[PDB]
Homo-oligomer: 555 residues x 3
Amino acid sequence: QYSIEADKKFKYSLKLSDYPTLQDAASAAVDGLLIDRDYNFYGGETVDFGGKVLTIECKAKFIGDGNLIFTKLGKGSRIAGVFMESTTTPWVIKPWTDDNQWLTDAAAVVATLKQSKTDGYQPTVSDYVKFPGIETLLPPNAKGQNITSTLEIRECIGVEVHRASGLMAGFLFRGCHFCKMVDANNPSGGKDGIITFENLSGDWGKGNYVIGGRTSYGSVSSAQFLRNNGGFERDGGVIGFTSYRAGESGVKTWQGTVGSTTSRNYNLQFRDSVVIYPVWDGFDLGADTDMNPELDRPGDYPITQYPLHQLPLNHLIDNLLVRGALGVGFGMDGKGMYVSNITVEDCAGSGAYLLTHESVFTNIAIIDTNTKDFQANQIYISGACRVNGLRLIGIRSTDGQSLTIDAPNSTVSGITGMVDPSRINVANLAEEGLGNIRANSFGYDSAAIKLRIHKLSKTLDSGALYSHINGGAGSGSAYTQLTAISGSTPDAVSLKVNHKDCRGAEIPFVPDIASDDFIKDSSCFLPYWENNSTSLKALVKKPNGELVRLTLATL
Amino acid sequence: QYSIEADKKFKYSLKLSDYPTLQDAASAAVDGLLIDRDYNFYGGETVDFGGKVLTIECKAKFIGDGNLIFTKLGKGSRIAGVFMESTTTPWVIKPWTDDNQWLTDAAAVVATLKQSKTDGYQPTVSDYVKFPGIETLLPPNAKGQNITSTLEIRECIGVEVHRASGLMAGFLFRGCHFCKMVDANNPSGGKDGIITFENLSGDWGKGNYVIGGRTSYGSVSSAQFLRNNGGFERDGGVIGFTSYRAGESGVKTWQGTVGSTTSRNYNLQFRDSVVIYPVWDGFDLGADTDMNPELDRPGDYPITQYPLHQLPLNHLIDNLLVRGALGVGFGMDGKGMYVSNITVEDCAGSGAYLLTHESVFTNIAIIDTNTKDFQANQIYISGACRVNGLRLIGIRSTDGQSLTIDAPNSTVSGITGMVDPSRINVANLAEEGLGNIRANSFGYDSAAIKLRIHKLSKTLDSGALYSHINGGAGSGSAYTQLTAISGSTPDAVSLKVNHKDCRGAEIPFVPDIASDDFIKDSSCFLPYWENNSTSLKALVKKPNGELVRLTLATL
Amino acid sequence: QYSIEADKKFKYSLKLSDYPTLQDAASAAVDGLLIDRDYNFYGGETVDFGGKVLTIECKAKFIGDGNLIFTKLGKGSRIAGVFMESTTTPWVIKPWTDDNQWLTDAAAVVATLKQSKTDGYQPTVSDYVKFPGIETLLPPNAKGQNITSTLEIRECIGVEVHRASGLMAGFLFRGCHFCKMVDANNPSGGKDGIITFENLSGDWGKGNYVIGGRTSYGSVSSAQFLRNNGGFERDGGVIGFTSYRAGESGVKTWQGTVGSTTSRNYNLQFRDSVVIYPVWDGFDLGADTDMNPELDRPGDYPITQYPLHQLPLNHLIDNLLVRGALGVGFGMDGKGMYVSNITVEDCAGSGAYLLTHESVFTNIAIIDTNTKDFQANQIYISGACRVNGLRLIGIRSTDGQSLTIDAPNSTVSGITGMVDPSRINVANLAEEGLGNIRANSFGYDSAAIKLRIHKLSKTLDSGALYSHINGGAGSGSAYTQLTAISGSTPDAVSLKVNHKDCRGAEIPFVPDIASDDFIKDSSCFLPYWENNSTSLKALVKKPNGELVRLTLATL
Ligand SMILES: [Ca+2]
């Protein structure tokens, strides 16, 4: 009698402590499943949840190298608090100092080696490129390691993993749809990506998100996607996420062919997220391979339809922050893209590397990047793009000859910052829509409005409008000067108004007999010097266009 | 004995499968209530939860056309995972192509008709305006449909609905306070608004939020408010939300009278949210009716106190993104408003439609909008407002004569982008606080600093300061030119410095006898031509202000 | 037999109603603990949770003045829905009007006194400074009150408090690590800080966050940190948070010595958050004491290593909004800082007060601040910093002489807004990287490009390039004018091109005999007046640099 009442009035949950294997618990579960004791799993251990909609509450660890594979969870299933930990304590490198300066010297990086499940990462082949010479210097026991404790959700729909954490930990959603990794509680990564949505088989992934939370370390990228397409609804991607110290990149959409098909991604959101101190890049949102690319795209659009780097990727990209990359802050490719509100600070390589065409970039800030001169420039754009608002330069100087922006096919407006103008290369730069203007000068005895024709010279101003103090401060007097370059000497030739408060115009004249072709316009005169009589002459182009030579000033 | 122990140590939850009706389960529930089987409800089915603080966990569907009404939930009650689904599969339209281009032709829209619970929406009367002629062309079976499966929370305080989803689904909070719709899991909408806080009766709504999540489709607006006032504490609104493909608008505060009282809203937050591909508008934050307005405001401030469009709405509006609207990206009205950090891209109608007065807009970006020329301009502001930072123009051209910004009573500073200056209309445009300036020119043999007096001509520059190459690249030589318009020919009259590297000033003279009134200032001279003697003359205004005519240059 | 089955298949939870004290329930709990009845606690009541990982679900109140202390919760424990309420109803002040105008007059503030647990705050000693004279005017029963109902989590790791609320409520994490205050459900504060992470004893705090949610009222700061260091991983801080009407500041990192050691903080995130209507400041992110500072830093870096205000605080600060402060919107100190995307509106004191050195500020907007002239300026920067993008001025005027920006050691670029240029003081202001420029003028018969040398005069332009209409609108004619200041009269001396459509240049001449030193450059001439013969003369500096005087124009 009581049993009838009790079966109706109490919440169903079983606990793993009461079962000899995880499958035994899974098979018996109805609603709740509590992980209340640490569970040692073998790599490839596979649990069949019978299509049941389960709420898996974790208050202990899953311990093992390799993958713990969950299958046949019903839509609406949730896994909370999971903690993955490897059995192996690998050798890790820590390529930064106790003052958070990046180490770049291979020998210094090797000297950091320790056995730990955190506070660094296992070297991989990409480290051989990142730290040149390290391949030879690393001891064999620190090369080729492959330690990750991975929770794999396999071929499920509508499963969410919440508040996950771990040590040498990874989370893989393989062949899943409408799944989410929510509020990741700072798992410390292993050899593989920390959060992966991989859909190389089956239908293109859709509805797969990283929402909130953060990760640390890992040998490769923190959050990554293969063969996902969010549809026009943009149903997938990364929102509200933080990546710290990825061994590769913070957020990565894969490029090129993986196995026999495309790993590329379309129609995802990348918004409201932060990547700090990646060893490679902050955001890597390209789809085509840059160096030595495939000649085809099996499973994707052919090269005949869209050239390399010109896929209609159509991601929704907004409100991203990157700081401290040892590689590139923000990288992408594609055609027809809109990108907005990107802030990149203090990166050793380019702040932005944009292999894009017919794309628009709005309100971009690239602040103290390429600080180790790893790339040619701070921001590169290959194709014919538009940039509307670009902040350049924080507090760092540049000693060498590298460009700040090289966007040779792009049209740009709204640069702010103490950029060295010789380090700008664009197709067209303009402020078409300014109002009435004032140039305010501080810390000088003059104010200047300068002109520079980059075709003539990228390094020398070709003319200027100046105002210069006469006397000293408080004099109530200045002179205005209109200048032109000659013989590569800026300001060589000039007209002045009010020099020494004289209230007159000082007019330059041709220092010898003027040639006919020196005068440009009709109804104008050009003064010139006749030294043989101590006279000024005037070459006059009359209103009718004919030339005459007159005497202008005499002894 | 065991029963005493068990009653104390187990969590209380009952499951709907054990009860014949939802009311029977509600009446028996203590703490938890599990929806473990699909439940078919009749429209208007009303459940009385006895004031109990319940945690309702949904792992199955509520199925029915019409409203499932929950009442008398205690403060702190939570409903998670709810899934609403209609019994009717209606006719829906899908006014976009397989390349995500909007369809605007009525006949093309009619051709998209299919029976589905998603992937489109049921036509409503607003479609008759949006797609002109469609009212005549739609078959009768596709007109006037009214399918929604709505969870209605009625007259409750402190109830939260989390992770809701569905098909033809809606969520209505009627007469509620301190309620939230949290992390909406992409419900696909029906005929009515997807998320509604309606407080037409009782106290003004307060504490009501949409937090996080997203919605898709629906015939009308995704998230909407009637008669809510967040108080000075700004306790309500929309934060962190995404709307896709609203049949009307993404986020809407209602305007005008509904029933017998005001539907307007005050003191709400609209922040950190995204609206993509609405059929009408991204954000519709107006309170007064634009076309054919009421002559009064029953239940609100009278017109005598605040004129139409001048209510002190006082919303907190920041960090919003809109892309792809078929209507207006961002619309509002009100007086005394501050708005910041708004980004609008790729809209067919105006990017921003601002019926505002004595309001401030900071860091606005309106990028490639009014692309179908549906409105007069890309950004319109009616009243006397201030705009501080305005990015205009992405990559699209404008073939016709429409203005980009028409803000005739507004003062604006900080435009960036390749705007056509003839398409700017403002009360005042200025950059008062620039430093020393350099104009850098790429892709031309000259650099230019131009002036345009819009009262004189909106299409022609009235004067310029140029620098032009002498010779070719690398010559180290340029000439500076100061010009003025005459006879509507820009640059008609000019003074040059260093033309052809001559190191002299070429000075324009009056091509005939100068009239007395041609000279402006004392202690100045004006050269002019005397053709009858092949002489230059000078009209001199002496230091004492009197005129004299002198001979300046002779044969 | 049934008991064996039941013990395995039901979720364990006990409820406080079944136990005489909270400790009795804690001791018996296994998994869940339900707070189902209001519980009156005594101040200092301490509960030992036995290291157990518990899920504490609150559906009733903890009632008491003083602290309810939770200890020995296991990592992964969660407390949801907690509601703290005092037993005392104190006297509170409400220093704002029914139109949300701040009250500043002490007598007016005293007149607001009422007994309530909300809608105002208990006066503290800081109010004596904020409202001068109020110390004398407050009745003794409204002074020195100390009412807070505080949930204290003591020396725990990995505990999260979710959806907390209350009246006169506070939340203290003392000596905790890896703890979070998540989705605070608008608790109304008491005398102490609403959310505090205090780590004065033990290891520096790390992993401690406020994530999401909001608070209202309180006598002091809403969210605050003492002796936390997030490490290079930036593992702690405030993300996604809203503070309303703090009695002191919205978000505060403490400064100086507290007790015997440092209260300072390093390496925290402050992002994506909003502070509205604080009585003092929006964000107070300083570490050193401004007024009457300590001569040392026990427990921290010594002054010999880092001077006052020059600590390497290294916080990650981005995407913050402040509106309506009665004090300062955004304040900080430190050296080597990067700060981005800060928006401050409508503050009575300075929008930003930056005691920083060698720091970079990118995309800052300070809009209508120092509105009550409480400080010297709207934005102050003490040290040698860089500002890249600064929006100034909304719609408010300034009647007095206060500066807008005073950043005397800083280099700034990219100011936008209707700033009064006389109210800018910086070390250097420049736009180095503009393209070809157009100045568009509306509402005037002229367009202007002005120059101002602040060393000469902060209030008068020293020269200008103008374009002015000849005739009226549509004439197709303008004149260009190049001017210079003399005798503190702007535009006193000028050269014109095309005045009255004459097609000639009007040239100013020296109104008397020119002195030798009036001419600057070789191969130039300077016209001057010889009144005794009604002649223009020319002072000529020949190509060889020697002077000669010629006759230029004669009767
Ligand atoms: Ca002469």
